[PDB]
């Protein structure tokens, strides 16, 4: 268990190394909607891309049910461009009435920005 008001770096580092624990991990977050929720979602979806599906509990959304295994490495993994930095060239296209494409940020993007 952890505090809901935990730093995003701590909770996500545990998540990455949870599958390599001696037995299945159950990560609980005490409190409300945690401050690190977008980074939790990011880490889980990435873990999913590496062949390990973390599941939300029925009881509450702030307990995550983590498996025990080894990451299935994909042949190719594309890292998204910084979504904040991405706003500037998109804004240029918006303000000038021209077009601009960002070929790695899509609708399934992990970033809030």
PDB file of N, CA and C in Angstrom:
ATOM      1  N   UNK A   1       0.812  -1.212   0.000  1.00  0.00           N
ATOM      2  CA  UNK A   1       0.000   0.000   0.000  1.00  0.00           C
ATOM      3  C   UNK A   1       0.849   1.268   0.000  1.00  0.00           C
ATOM      4  N   UNK A   2       0.295   2.328  -0.585  1.00  0.00           N
ATOM      5  CA  UNK A   2       0.934   3.643  -0.640  1.00  0.00           C
ATOM      6  C   UNK A   2      -0.105   4.726  -0.396  1.00  0.00           C
ATOM      7  N   UNK A   3       0.362   5.948  -0.146  1.00  0.00           N
ATOM      8  CA  UNK A   3      -0.526   7.104  -0.061  1.00  0.00           C
ATOM      9  C   UNK A   3      -1.006   7.466  -1.461  1.00  0.00           C
ATOM     10  N   UNK A   4      -2.230   7.978  -1.568  1.00  0.00           N
ATOM     11  CA  UNK A   4      -2.749   8.475  -2.847  1.00  0.00           C
ATOM     12  C   UNK A   4      -1.975   9.719  -3.283  1.00  0.00           C
ATOM     13  N   UNK A   5      -1.478  10.471  -2.300  1.00  0.00           N
ATOM     14  CA  UNK A   5      -0.673  11.669  -2.536  1.00  0.00           C
ATOM     15  C   UNK A   5       0.828  11.349  -2.601  1.00  0.00           C
ATOM     16  N   UNK A   6       1.170  10.265  -3.295  1.00  0.00           N
ATOM     17  CA  UNK A   6       2.557   9.845  -3.467  1.00  0.00           C
ATOM     18  C   UNK A   6       3.111  10.464  -4.740  1.00  0.00           C
ATOM     19  N   UNK A   7       4.423  10.696  -4.759  1.00  0.00           N
ATOM     20  CA  UNK A   7       5.105  11.175  -5.957  1.00  0.00           C
ATOM     21  C   UNK A   7       4.928  10.160  -7.084  1.00  0.00           C
ATOM     22  N   UNK A   8       4.713  10.660  -8.298  1.00  0.00           N
ATOM     23  CA  UNK A   8       4.464   9.800  -9.458  1.00  0.00           C
ATOM     24  C   UNK A   8       5.637   8.870  -9.763  1.00  0.00           C
ATOM     25  N   UNK A   9       6.852   9.328  -9.473  1.00  0.00           N
ATOM     26  CA  UNK A   9       8.051   8.534  -9.717  1.00  0.00           C
ATOM     27  C   UNK A   9       8.125   7.291  -8.832  1.00  0.00           C
ATOM     28  N   UNK A  10       7.699   7.407  -7.577  1.00  0.00           N
ATOM     29  CA  UNK A  10       7.746   6.277  -6.644  1.00  0.00           C
ATOM     30  C   UNK A  10       6.779   5.168  -7.055  1.00  0.00           C
ATOM     31  N   UNK A  11       5.503   5.521  -7.200  1.00  0.00           N
ATOM     32  CA  UNK A  11       4.457   4.541  -7.521  1.00  0.00           C
ATOM     33  C   UNK A  11       4.726   3.824  -8.842  1.00  0.00           C
ATOM     34  N   UNK A  12       5.218   4.559  -9.832  1.00  0.00           N
ATOM     35  CA  UNK A  12       5.463   3.979 -11.145  1.00  0.00           C
ATOM     36  C   UNK A  12       6.718   3.102 -11.169  1.00  0.00           C
ATOM     37  N   UNK A  13       7.705   3.390 -10.319  1.00  0.00           N
ATOM     38  CA  UNK A  13       8.912   2.551 -10.240  1.00  0.00           C
ATOM     39  C   UNK A  13       8.604   1.187  -9.622  1.00  0.00           C
ATOM     40  N   UNK A  14       7.692   1.171  -8.653  1.00  0.00           N
ATOM     41  CA  UNK A  14       7.220  -0.070  -8.041  1.00  0.00           C
ATOM     42  C   UNK A  14       6.450  -0.899  -9.066  1.00  0.00           C
ATOM     43  N   UNK A  15       5.583  -0.236  -9.827  1.00  0.00           N
ATOM     44  CA  UNK A  15       4.800  -0.897 -10.872  1.00  0.00           C
ATOM     45  C   UNK A  15       5.666  -1.630 -11.903  1.00  0.00           C
ATOM     46  N   UNK A  16       6.805  -1.041 -12.265  1.00  0.00           N
ATOM     47  CA  UNK A  16       7.674  -1.618 -13.302  1.00  0.00           C
ATOM     48  C   UNK A  16       8.333  -2.878 -12.788  1.00  0.00           C
ATOM     49  N   UNK A  17       8.657  -2.901 -11.493  1.00  0.00           N
ATOM     50  CA  UNK A  17       9.368  -4.025 -10.870  1.00  0.00           C
ATOM     51  C   UNK A  17       8.454  -4.985 -10.091  1.00  0.00           C
ATOM     52  N   UNK A  18       7.145  -4.748 -10.142  1.00  0.00           N
ATOM     53  CA  UNK A  18       6.171  -5.597  -9.452  1.00  0.00           C
ATOM     54  C   UNK A  18       6.070  -7.008 -10.044  1.00  0.00           C
ATOM     55  N   UNK A  19       6.128  -7.137 -11.386  1.00  0.00           N
ATOM     56  CA  UNK A  19       6.066  -8.475 -11.992  1.00  0.00           C
ATOM     57  C   UNK A  19       7.236  -9.391 -11.627  1.00  0.00           C
ATOM     58  N   UNK A  20       8.374  -8.806 -11.256  1.00  0.00           N
ATOM     59  CA  UNK A  20       9.560  -9.581 -10.896  1.00  0.00           C
ATOM     60  C   UNK A  20       9.666  -9.813  -9.389  1.00  0.00           C
ATOM     61  N   UNK A  21       8.563  -9.594  -8.670  1.00  0.00           N
ATOM     62  CA  UNK A  21       8.469  -9.952  -7.258  1.00  0.00           C
ATOM     63  C   UNK A  21       8.299 -11.461  -7.112  1.00  0.00           C
ATOM     64  N   UNK A  22       8.532 -11.961  -5.901  1.00  0.00           N
ATOM     65  CA  UNK A  22       8.467 -13.399  -5.631  1.00  0.00           C
ATOM     66  C   UNK A  22       7.063 -13.977  -5.825  1.00  0.00           C
ATOM     67  N   UNK A  23       6.033 -13.146  -5.671  1.00  0.00           N
ATOM     68  CA  UNK A  23       4.660 -13.561  -5.965  1.00  0.00           C
ATOM     69  C   UNK A  23       3.774 -12.355  -6.296  1.00  0.00           C
ATOM     70  N   UNK A  24       2.662 -12.578  -7.034  1.00  0.00           N
ATOM     71  CA  UNK A  24       1.732 -11.536  -7.483  1.00  0.00           C
ATOM     72  C   UNK A  24       1.536 -10.357  -6.522  1.00  0.00           C
ATOM     73  N   UNK A  25       1.624  -9.144  -7.067  1.00  0.00           N
ATOM     74  CA  UNK A  25       1.566  -7.911  -6.286  1.00  0.00           C
ATOM     75  C   UNK A  25       0.182  -7.265  -6.378  1.00  0.00           C
ATOM     76  N   UNK A  26      -0.300  -6.759  -5.246  1.00  0.00           N
ATOM     77  CA  UNK A  26      -1.561  -6.027  -5.174  1.00  0.00           C
ATOM     78  C   UNK A  26      -1.258  -4.630  -4.638  1.00  0.00           C
ATOM     79  N   UNK A  27      -1.250  -3.648  -5.536  1.00  0.00           N
ATOM     80  CA  UNK A  27      -0.883  -2.277  -5.193  1.00  0.00           C
ATOM     81  C   UNK A  27      -2.133  -1.494  -4.790  1.00  0.00           C
ATOM     82  N   UNK A  28      -2.180  -1.039  -3.539  1.00  0.00           N
ATOM     83  CA  UNK A  28      -3.306  -0.247  -3.036  1.00  0.00           C
ATOM     84  C   UNK A  28      -2.890   1.210  -2.802  1.00  0.00           C
ATOM     85  N   UNK A  29      -3.783   2.142  -3.133  1.00  0.00           N
ATOM     86  CA  UNK A  29      -3.545   3.571  -2.908  1.00  0.00           C
ATOM     87  C   UNK A  29      -4.607   4.136  -1.964  1.00  0.00           C
ATOM     88  N   UNK A  30      -4.215   4.418  -0.721  1.00  0.00           N
ATOM     89  CA  UNK A  30      -5.151   4.941   0.284  1.00  0.00           C
ATOM     90  C   UNK A  30      -5.368   6.447   0.103  1.00  0.00           C
ATOM     91  N   UNK A  31      -6.629   6.870   0.146  1.00  0.00           N
ATOM     92  CA  UNK A  31      -6.998   8.273  -0.047  1.00  0.00           C
ATOM     93  C   UNK A  31      -8.035   8.425  -1.145  1.00  0.00           C
ATOM     94  N   UNK A  32      -7.960   9.537  -1.874  1.00  0.00           N
ATOM     95  CA  UNK A  32      -8.893   9.824  -2.966  1.00  0.00           C
ATOM     96  C   UNK A  32      -8.292   9.490  -4.315  1.00  0.00           C
ATOM     97  N   UNK A  33      -8.752  10.185  -5.354  1.00  0.00           N
ATOM     98  CA  UNK A  33      -8.167  10.057  -6.684  1.00  0.00           C
ATOM     99  C   UNK A  33      -6.723  10.540  -6.602  1.00  0.00           C
ATOM    100  N   UNK A  34      -5.750   9.636  -6.825  1.00  0.00           N
ATOM    101  CA  UNK A  34      -4.343   9.978  -6.580  1.00  0.00           C
ATOM    102  C   UNK A  34      -3.790  11.045  -7.528  1.00  0.00           C
ATOM    103  N   UNK A  35      -2.821  11.813  -7.033  1.00  0.00           N
ATOM    104  CA  UNK A  35      -2.251  12.940  -7.776  1.00  0.00           C
ATOM    105  C   UNK A  35      -1.492  12.440  -9.007  1.00  0.00           C
ATOM    106  N   UNK A  36      -0.929  11.241  -8.890  1.00  0.00           N
ATOM    107  CA  UNK A  36      -0.095  10.639  -9.927  1.00  0.00           C
ATOM    108  C   UNK A  36      -0.865   9.794 -10.963  1.00  0.00           C
ATOM    109  N   UNK A  37      -2.194   9.922 -10.999  1.00  0.00           N
ATOM    110  CA  UNK A  37      -3.051   9.045 -11.820  1.00  0.00           C
ATOM    111  C   UNK A  37      -2.714   8.994 -13.321  1.00  0.00           C
ATOM    112  N   UNK A  38      -2.431  10.152 -13.953  1.00  0.00           N
ATOM    113  CA  UNK A  38      -2.016  10.089 -15.362  1.00  0.00           C
ATOM    114  C   UNK A  38      -0.720   9.301 -15.587  1.00  0.00           C
ATOM    115  N   UNK A  39       0.233   9.430 -14.662  1.00  0.00           N
ATOM    116  CA  UNK A  39       1.496   8.689 -14.733  1.00  0.00           C
ATOM    117  C   UNK A  39       1.335   7.212 -14.369  1.00  0.00           C
ATOM    118  N   UNK A  40       0.346   6.901 -13.536  1.00  0.00           N
ATOM    119  CA  UNK A  40      -0.019   5.510 -13.265  1.00  0.00           C
ATOM    120  C   UNK A  40      -0.592   4.876 -14.538  1.00  0.00           C
ATOM    121  N   UNK A  41      -1.572   5.549 -15.142  1.00  0.00           N
ATOM    122  CA  UNK A  41      -2.164   5.117 -16.417  1.00  0.00           C
ATOM    123  C   UNK A  41      -1.105   4.930 -17.504  1.00  0.00           C
ATOM    124  N   UNK A  42      -0.151   5.861 -17.574  1.00  0.00           N
ATOM    125  CA  UNK A  42       0.943   5.791 -18.547  1.00  0.00           C
ATOM    126  C   UNK A  42       1.737   4.535 -18.343  1.00  0.00           C
ATOM    127  N   UNK A  43       2.212   4.328 -17.120  1.00  0.00           N
ATOM    128  CA  UNK A  43       3.066   3.184 -16.811  1.00  0.00           C
ATOM    129  C   UNK A  43       2.364   1.850 -17.089  1.00  0.00           C
ATOM    130  N   UNK A  44       1.085   1.758 -16.733  1.00  0.00           N
ATOM    131  CA  UNK A  44       0.298   0.536 -16.952  1.00  0.00           C
ATOM    132  C   UNK A  44       0.123   0.227 -18.441  1.00  0.00           C
ATOM    133  N   UNK A  45      -0.229   1.245 -19.220  1.00  0.00           N
ATOM    134  CA  UNK A  45      -0.428   1.080 -20.660  1.00  0.00           C
ATOM    135  C   UNK A  45       0.877   0.695 -21.361  1.00  0.00           C
ATOM    136  N   UNK A  46       1.997   1.206 -20.852  1.00  0.00           N
ATOM    137  CA  UNK A  46       3.317   0.850 -21.371  1.00  0.00           C
ATOM    138  C   UNK A  46       3.643  -0.575 -21.004  1.00  0.00           C
ATOM    139  N   UNK A  47       3.385  -0.951 -19.752  1.00  0.00           N
ATOM    140  CA  UNK A  47       3.549  -2.345 -19.318  1.00  0.00           C
ATOM    141  C   UNK A  47       2.719  -3.268 -20.174  1.00  0.00           C
ATOM    142  N   UNK A  48       1.530  -2.815 -20.564  1.00  0.00           N
ATOM    143  CA  UNK A  48       0.679  -3.570 -21.485  1.00  0.00           C
ATOM    144  C   UNK A  48       1.344  -3.743 -22.853  1.00  0.00           C
ATOM    145  N   UNK A  49       1.977  -2.685 -23.358  1.00  0.00           N
ATOM    146  CA  UNK A  49       2.721  -2.767 -24.619  1.00  0.00           C
ATOM    147  C   UNK A  49       3.875  -3.771 -24.554  1.00  0.00           C
ATOM    148  N   UNK A  50       4.396  -4.011 -23.351  1.00  0.00           N
ATOM    149  CA  UNK A  50       5.439  -5.019 -23.132  1.00  0.00           C
ATOM    150  C   UNK A  50       4.878  -6.345 -22.582  1.00  0.00           C
ATOM    151  N   UNK A  51       3.644  -6.671 -22.964  1.00  0.00           N
ATOM    152  CA  UNK A  51       3.068  -7.993 -22.715  1.00  0.00           C
ATOM    153  C   UNK A  51       2.666  -8.327 -21.286  1.00  0.00           C
ATOM    154  N   UNK A  52       2.385  -7.312 -20.472  1.00  0.00           N
ATOM    155  CA  UNK A  52       1.930  -7.530 -19.094  1.00  0.00           C
ATOM    156  C   UNK A  52       0.736  -6.629 -18.761  1.00  0.00           C
ATOM    157  N   UNK A  53      -0.427  -7.260 -18.597  1.00  0.00           N
ATOM    158  CA  UNK A  53      -1.688  -6.557 -18.387  1.00  0.00           C
ATOM    159  C   UNK A  53      -1.993  -6.393 -16.893  1.00  0.00           C
ATOM    160  N   UNK A  54      -1.969  -5.150 -16.413  1.00  0.00           N
ATOM    161  CA  UNK A  54      -2.389  -4.832 -15.046  1.00  0.00           C
ATOM    162  C   UNK A  54      -3.887  -4.574 -15.079  1.00  0.00           C
ATOM    163  N   UNK A  55      -4.604  -5.035 -14.055  1.00  0.00           N
ATOM    164  CA  UNK A  55      -6.064  -4.914 -14.026  1.00  0.00           C
ATOM    165  C   UNK A  55      -6.576  -4.122 -12.826  1.00  0.00           C
ATOM    166  N   UNK A  56      -7.538  -3.242 -13.093  1.00  0.00           N
ATOM    167  CA  UNK A  56      -8.233  -2.509 -12.047  1.00  0.00           C
ATOM    168  C   UNK A  56      -9.133  -3.472 -11.280  1.00  0.00           C
ATOM    169  N   UNK A  57      -9.264  -3.240  -9.977  1.00  0.00           N
ATOM    170  CA  UNK A  57     -10.120  -4.074  -9.139  1.00  0.00           C
ATOM    171  C   UNK A  57     -11.570  -3.625  -9.262  1.00  0.00           C
ATOM    172  N   UNK A  58     -12.489  -4.567  -9.067  1.00  0.00           N
ATOM    173  CA  UNK A  58     -13.918  -4.271  -9.061  1.00  0.00           C
ATOM    174  C   UNK A  58     -14.288  -3.443  -7.831  1.00  0.00           C
ATOM    175  N   UNK A  59     -13.764  -3.846  -6.670  1.00  0.00           N
ATOM    176  CA  UNK A  59     -14.046  -3.179  -5.393  1.00  0.00           C
ATOM    177  C   UNK A  59     -13.815  -1.666  -5.451  1.00  0.00           C
ATOM    178  N   UNK A  60     -12.589  -1.253  -5.770  1.00  0.00           N
ATOM    179  CA  UNK A  60     -12.280   0.167  -5.946  1.00  0.00           C
ATOM    180  C   UNK A  60     -11.243   0.383  -7.052  1.00  0.00           C
ATOM    181  N   UNK A  61     -11.262   1.573  -7.679  1.00  0.00           N
ATOM    182  CA  UNK A  61     -10.314   1.867  -8.754  1.00  0.00           C
ATOM    183  C   UNK A  61      -8.880   2.142  -8.279  1.00  0.00           C
ATOM    184  N   UNK A  62      -8.702   2.427  -6.987  1.00  0.00           N
ATOM    185  CA  UNK A  62      -7.381   2.750  -6.439  1.00  0.00           C
ATOM    186  C   UNK A  62      -6.604   1.551  -5.873  1.00  0.00           C
ATOM    187  N   UNK A  63      -7.011   0.338  -6.248  1.00  0.00           N
ATOM    188  CA  UNK A  63      -6.205  -0.860  -6.010  1.00  0.00           C
ATOM    189  C   UNK A  63      -5.957  -1.558  -7.345  1.00  0.00           C
ATOM    190  N   UNK A  64      -4.684  -1.773  -7.673  1.00  0.00           N
ATOM    191  CA  UNK A  64      -4.292  -2.337  -8.963  1.00  0.00           C
ATOM    192  C   UNK A  64      -3.766  -3.760  -8.800  1.00  0.00           C
ATOM    193  N   UNK A  65      -4.317  -4.670  -9.599  1.00  0.00           N
ATOM    194  CA  UNK A  65      -4.003  -6.091  -9.508  1.00  0.00           C
ATOM    195  C   UNK A  65      -2.909  -6.435 -10.520  1.00  0.00           C
ATOM    196  N   UNK A  66      -1.693  -6.680 -10.028  1.00  0.00           N
ATOM    197  CA  UNK A  66      -0.520  -6.851 -10.893  1.00  0.00           C
ATOM    198  C   UNK A  66      -0.105  -8.322 -10.987  1.00  0.00           C
ATOM    199  N   UNK A  67       0.162  -8.811 -12.213  1.00  0.00           N
ATOM    200  CA  UNK A  67       0.603 -10.194 -12.405  1.00  0.00           C
ATOM    201  C   UNK A  67       2.063 -10.440 -12.011  1.00  0.00           C
ATOM    202  N   UNK A  68       2.516 -11.679 -12.200  1.00  0.00           N
ATOM    203  CA  UNK A  68       3.900 -12.073 -11.947  1.00  0.00           C
ATOM    204  C   UNK A  68       4.453 -12.783 -13.180  1.00  0.00           C
ATOM    205  N   UNK A  69       5.323 -12.097 -13.920  1.00  0.00           N
ATOM    206  CA  UNK A  69       5.935 -12.661 -15.121  1.00  0.00           C
ATOM    207  C   UNK A  69       7.080 -11.817 -15.653  1.00  0.00           C
ATOM    208  N   UNK A  70       7.437 -12.047 -16.914  1.00  0.00           N
ATOM    209  CA  UNK A  70       8.538 -11.342 -17.574  1.00  0.00           C
ATOM    210  C   UNK A  70       7.984 -10.586 -18.774  1.00  0.00           C
ATOM    211  N   UNK A  71       8.484  -9.373 -19.000  1.00  0.00           N
ATOM    212  CA  UNK A  71       7.996  -8.538 -20.096  1.00  0.00           C
ATOM    213  C   UNK A  71       8.325  -9.166 -21.450  1.00  0.00           C
ATOM    214  N   UNK A  72       7.306  -9.319 -22.296  1.00  0.00           N
ATOM    215  CA  UNK A  72       7.508  -9.735 -23.685  1.00  0.00           C
ATOM    216  C   UNK A  72       7.897  -8.504 -24.505  1.00  0.00           C
ATOM    217  N   UNK A  73       9.198  -8.363 -24.760  1.00  0.00           N
ATOM    218  CA  UNK A  73       9.739  -7.215 -25.493  1.00  0.00           C
ATOM    219  C   UNK A  73       9.258  -7.170 -26.939  1.00  0.00           C
ATOM    220  N   UNK A  74       8.623  -6.057 -27.340  1.00  0.00           N
ATOM    221  CA  UNK A  74       8.209  -5.935 -28.729  1.00  0.00           C
ATOM    222  C   UNK A  74       9.409  -5.647 -29.637  1.00  0.00           C
ATOM    223  N   UNK A  75       9.320  -6.015 -30.929  1.00  0.00           N
ATOM    224  CA  UNK A  75      10.430  -5.736 -31.842  1.00  0.00           C
ATOM    225  C   UNK A  75      10.715  -4.246 -31.964  1.00  0.00           C
ATOM    226  N   UNK A  76       9.655  -3.451 -31.890  1.00  0.00           N
ATOM    227  CA  UNK A  76       9.737  -2.023 -32.105  1.00  0.00           C
ATOM    228  C   UNK A  76       8.877  -1.310 -31.064  1.00  0.00           C
ATOM    229  N   UNK A  77       9.431  -0.273 -30.433  1.00  0.00           N
ATOM    230  CA  UNK A  77       8.647   0.619 -29.577  1.00  0.00           C
ATOM    231  C   UNK A  77       8.935   2.082 -29.898  1.00  0.00           C
ATOM    232  N   UNK A  78       7.890   2.791 -30.312  1.00  0.00           N
ATOM    233  CA  UNK A  78       7.990   4.193 -30.677  1.00  0.00           C
ATOM    234  C   UNK A  78       7.683   5.059 -29.460  1.00  0.00           C
ATOM    235  N   UNK A  79       8.625   5.928 -29.103  1.00  0.00           N
ATOM    236  CA  UNK A  79       8.431   6.882 -28.018  1.00  0.00           C
ATOM    237  C   UNK A  79       7.754   8.120 -28.575  1.00  0.00           C
ATOM    238  N   UNK A  80       6.733   8.587 -27.869  1.00  0.00           N
ATOM    239  CA  UNK A  80       5.997   9.771 -28.284  1.00  0.00           C
ATOM    240  C   UNK A  80       6.843  11.015 -28.062  1.00  0.00           C
ATOM    241  N   UNK A  81       6.642  12.017 -28.913  1.00  0.00           N
ATOM    242  CA  UNK A  81       7.281  13.313 -28.734  1.00  0.00           C
ATOM    243  C   UNK A  81       6.617  14.012 -27.557  1.00  0.00           C
ATOM    244  N   UNK A  82       7.366  14.878 -26.881  1.00  0.00           N
ATOM    245  CA  UNK A  82       6.834  15.610 -25.741  1.00  0.00           C
ATOM    246  C   UNK A  82       5.571  16.339 -26.191  1.00  0.00           C
ATOM    247  N   UNK A  83       4.460  16.033 -25.532  1.00  0.00           N
ATOM    248  CA  UNK A  83       3.159  16.553 -25.937  1.00  0.00           C
ATOM    249  C   UNK A  83       3.041  18.053 -25.681  1.00  0.00           C
ATOM    250  N   UNK A  84       3.748  18.538 -24.661  1.00  0.00           N
ATOM    251  CA  UNK A  84       3.784  19.964 -24.363  1.00  0.00           C
ATOM    252  C   UNK A  84       4.550  20.698 -25.460  1.00  0.00           C
ATOM    253  N   UNK A  85       5.759  20.219 -25.755  1.00  0.00           N
ATOM    254  CA  UNK A  85       6.561  20.760 -26.857  1.00  0.00           C
ATOM    255  C   UNK A  85       5.791  20.669 -28.178  1.00  0.00           C
ATOM    256  N   UNK A  86       5.017  19.598 -28.335  1.00  0.00           N
ATOM    257  CA  UNK A  86       4.180  19.387 -29.521  1.00  0.00           C
ATOM    258  C   UNK A  86       3.135  20.478 -29.774  1.00  0.00           C
ATOM    259  N   UNK A  87       2.726  21.186 -28.725  1.00  0.00           N
ATOM    260  CA  UNK A  87       1.683  22.201 -28.851  1.00  0.00           C
ATOM    261  C   UNK A  87       2.134  23.383 -29.700  1.00  0.00           C
ATOM    262  N   UNK A  88       3.418  23.716 -29.623  1.00  0.00           N
ATOM    263  CA  UNK A  88       3.938  24.910 -30.292  1.00  0.00           C
ATOM    264  C   UNK A  88       3.858  24.831 -31.824  1.00  0.00           C
ATOM    265  N   UNK A  89       4.391  23.760 -32.440  1.00  0.00           N
ATOM    266  CA  UNK A  89       4.243  23.656 -33.896  1.00  0.00           C
ATOM    267  C   UNK A  89       2.799  23.432 -34.363  1.00  0.00           C
ATOM    268  N   UNK A  90       1.982  22.778 -33.539  1.00  0.00           N
ATOM    269  CA  UNK A  90       0.546  22.653 -33.818  1.00  0.00           C
ATOM    270  C   UNK A  90      -0.156  24.010 -33.738  1.00  0.00           C
ATOM    271  N   UNK A  91       0.263  24.832 -32.781  1.00  0.00           N
ATOM    272  CA  UNK A  91      -0.294  26.170 -32.616  1.00  0.00           C
ATOM    273  C   UNK A  91       0.063  27.075 -33.792  1.00  0.00           C
ATOM    274  N   UNK A  92       1.240  26.861 -34.380  1.00  0.00           N
ATOM    275  CA  UNK A  92       1.666  27.622 -35.560  1.00  0.00           C
ATOM    276  C   UNK A  92       0.729  27.340 -36.730  1.00  0.00           C
ATOM    277  N   UNK A  93       0.413  26.067 -36.940  1.00  0.00           N
ATOM    278  CA  UNK A  93      -0.535  25.677 -37.980  1.00  0.00           C
ATOM    279  C   UNK A  93      -1.925  26.260 -37.719  1.00  0.00           C
ATOM    280  N   UNK A  94      -2.322  26.301 -36.451  1.00  0.00           N
ATOM    281  CA  UNK A  94      -3.626  26.840 -36.061  1.00  0.00           C
ATOM    282  C   UNK A  94      -3.739  28.342 -36.319  1.00  0.00           C
ATOM    283  N   UNK A  95      -2.717  29.087 -35.910  1.00  0.00           N
ATOM    284  CA  UNK A  95      -2.751  30.546 -35.989  1.00  0.00           C
ATOM    285  C   UNK A  95      -2.526  31.071 -37.418  1.00  0.00           C
ATOM    286  N   UNK A  96      -1.793  30.309 -38.232  1.00  0.00           N
ATOM    287  CA  UNK A  96      -1.438  30.720 -39.594  1.00  0.00           C
ATOM    288  C   UNK A  96      -2.331  30.138 -40.691  1.00  0.00           C
ATOM    289  N   UNK A  97      -3.218  29.218 -40.330  1.00  0.00           N
ATOM    290  CA  UNK A  97      -4.131  28.613 -41.298  1.00  0.00           C
ATOM    291  C   UNK A  97      -3.467  27.633 -42.244  1.00  0.00           C
ATOM    292  N   UNK A  98      -2.344  27.065 -41.811  1.00  0.00           N
ATOM    293  CA  UNK A  98      -1.640  26.031 -42.559  1.00  0.00           C
ATOM    294  C   UNK A  98      -1.861  24.699 -41.846  1.00  0.00           C
ATOM    295  N   UNK A  99      -1.178  23.652 -42.298  1.00  0.00           N
ATOM    296  CA  UNK A  99      -1.324  22.322 -41.714  1.00  0.00           C
ATOM    297  C   UNK A  99      -0.023  21.850 -41.058  1.00  0.00           C
ATOM    298  N   UNK A 100      -0.152  21.008 -40.034  1.00  0.00           N
ATOM    299  CA  UNK A 100       1.004  20.396 -39.376  1.00  0.00           C
ATOM    300  C   UNK A 100       0.628  19.059 -38.765  1.00  0.00           C
ATOM    301  N   UNK A 101       1.521  18.084 -38.901  1.00  0.00           N
ATOM    302  CA  UNK A 101       1.274  16.731 -38.424  1.00  0.00           C
ATOM    303  C   UNK A 101       2.353  16.315 -37.431  1.00  0.00           C
ATOM    304  N   UNK A 102       1.931  15.670 -36.350  1.00  0.00           N
ATOM    305  CA  UNK A 102       2.852  15.106 -35.377  1.00  0.00           C
ATOM    306  C   UNK A 102       2.678  13.593 -35.417  1.00  0.00           C
ATOM    307  N   UNK A 103       3.612  12.892 -36.084  1.00  0.00           N
ATOM    308  CA  UNK A 103       3.400  11.506 -36.514  1.00  0.00           C
ATOM    309  C   UNK A 103       3.487  10.422 -35.434  1.00  0.00           C
ATOM    310  N   UNK A 104       3.695  10.802 -34.173  1.00  0.00           N
ATOM    311  CA  UNK A 104       3.765   9.824 -33.086  1.00  0.00           C
ATOM    312  C   UNK A 104       2.841  10.071 -31.888  1.00  0.00           C
ATOM    313  N   UNK A 105       2.181  11.227 -31.840  1.00  0.00           N
ATOM    314  CA  UNK A 105       1.142  11.482 -30.844  1.00  0.00           C
ATOM    315  C   UNK A 105      -0.217  11.287 -31.501  1.00  0.00           C
ATOM    316  N   UNK A 106      -0.999  10.341 -30.985  1.00  0.00           N
ATOM    317  CA  UNK A 106      -2.326  10.049 -31.521  1.00  0.00           C
ATOM    318  C   UNK A 106      -3.407  10.075 -30.460  1.00  0.00           C
ATOM    319  N   UNK A 107      -4.554   9.484 -30.786  1.00  0.00           N
ATOM    320  CA  UNK A 107      -5.690   9.412 -29.866  1.00  0.00           C
ATOM    321  C   UNK A 107      -5.427   8.488 -28.669  1.00  0.00           C
ATOM    322  N   UNK A 108      -4.543   7.506 -28.844  1.00  0.00           N
ATOM    323  CA  UNK A 108      -4.151   6.612 -27.752  1.00  0.00           C
ATOM    324  C   UNK A 108      -2.935   7.124 -26.969  1.00  0.00           C
ATOM    325  N   UNK A 109      -2.585   8.402 -27.132  1.00  0.00           N
ATOM    326  CA  UNK A 109      -1.407   8.977 -26.481  1.00  0.00           C
ATOM    327  C   UNK A 109      -1.514   8.950 -24.961  1.00  0.00           C
ATOM    328  N   UNK A 110      -0.400   8.616 -24.314  1.00  0.00           N
ATOM    329  CA  UNK A 110      -0.353   8.483 -22.862  1.00  0.00           C
ATOM    330  C   UNK A 110      -0.247   9.823 -22.124  1.00  0.00           C
ATOM    331  N   UNK A 111      -0.006  10.912 -22.851  1.00  0.00           N
ATOM    332  CA  UNK A 111       0.304  12.200 -22.226  1.00  0.00           C
ATOM    333  C   UNK A 111      -0.924  13.082 -22.089  1.00  0.00           C
ATOM    334  N   UNK A 112      -1.038  13.744 -20.941  1.00  0.00           N
ATOM    335  CA  UNK A 112      -2.153  14.641 -20.671  1.00  0.00           C
ATOM    336  C   UNK A 112      -2.159  15.847 -21.591  1.00  0.00           C
ATOM    337  N   UNK A 113      -0.972  16.377 -21.881  1.00  0.00           N
ATOM    338  CA  UNK A 113      -0.832  17.561 -22.734  1.00  0.00           C
ATOM    339  C   UNK A 113      -1.156  17.291 -24.214  1.00  0.00           C
TER     340      UNK A 113
END
